[PDB]
């Protein structure tokens, strides 16, 4: 949120904004509550995240590369 | 095209003095492959440019070429549902290409007597950016200036 880079900056270097959200929560509550889709989109979020992890421990094929 | 990056054919310079840029200029004026008649016009308009300016044949064309040579053009790069233009820098081998093309098409209009009198005046007004040859370079920048917010 706050960044100084006291004397020798000469450039923004403002990665502390994107270090927490800077867009994430403000482009999430500006519309679309549903009281429902946060449950559905989060059930499928970890459902696909664990299959990317399941194939992360099951990629032991030769694949000839 | 789709995949091939071509290598263009070699161009033979003008058979009066070494100038490959002039060899492409007569090709833009070129109608129905009549090279002999087309070379007679790119000559007779060139010394007549020299008597009206006191320069040589090579340097007088380059004076009028810099006023018809653009630097940025607008192309339609589709991002999604909206449709606008995108300004990009002109390639150096492309900079003269539509610059020499604008001189010919502007000399296609405004008929005084004959073609040799047309592009000779077209090179005269483009030497001090007066005629329509530089205006067709001017207005391209207006679409480039009004759409330069797309990058």
């Amino acid at each position: 949120i706050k960044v100084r880079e006291n004397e020798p900056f000469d450039v923004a270097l403002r990665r502390f904004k994107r270090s927490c959200e800077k867009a994430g929560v403000l482009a999430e509550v500006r519309r679309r509550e549903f009281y429902e889709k946060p449950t559905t989109e989060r059930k499928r979020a970890k459902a696909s995240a664990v299959k990317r992890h399941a194939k992360k421990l099951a990629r032991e094929n030769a694949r000839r590369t | 095209p789709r995949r091939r990056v071509i290598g263009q054919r070699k161009i033979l310079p003008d058979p009066k003095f070494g100038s490959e840029l002039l060899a492409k200029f007569v090709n833009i004026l070129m109608v129905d492959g009549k090279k002999s008649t087309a070379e007679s016009i790119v000559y007779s308009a060139l010394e007549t440019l020299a008597q009206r300016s006191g320069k040589s044949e090579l340097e007088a064309f380059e004076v009028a070429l810099e006023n018809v040579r653009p630097t940025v053009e607008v192309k339609s790069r589709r991002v999604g549902g909206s449709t606008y233009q995108v300004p990009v820098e002109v390639r150096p081998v492309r900079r003269n290409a539509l610059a020499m093309r604008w001189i010919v098409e502007a000399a296609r209009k405004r008929g005084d007597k004959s073609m040799a009198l047309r592009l000779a005046n077209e090179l005269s007004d483009a030497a001090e950016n007066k005629g329509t040859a530089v205006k067709k370079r001017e207005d391209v920048h207006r679409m480039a200036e009004a759409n330069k917010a797309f990058a």
């Binding site: 949120i1 502390f16 270090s19 927490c20 | -």
Partner: protein
């Protein structure tokens, strides 16, 4: 991956704000247990401590006060 009172056992206190500042970012937000590696038992207790220190004005809710 780091560890906390799950090994060096002590009860979570809302008054020792010196240790509580290590588990909040510069914006005052609570750092998740997926970064610090703390157990879920003490993360819930830590969450109450941060909320309690925010109530007693020992830790800021944010930096925009």
């Amino acid at each position: 991956f780091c560890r906390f009172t799950a090994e060096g056992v002590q009860e979570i206190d809302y008054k020792d704000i010196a240790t509580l500042k290590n588990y909040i970012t510069e914006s005052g937000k609570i750092v998740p247990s997926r970064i610090t590696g703390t157990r879920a038992k003490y993360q819930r207790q830590l969450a109450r401590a941060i909320k309690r220190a925010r109530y007693l004005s020992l830790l800021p809710y944010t930096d925009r006060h």
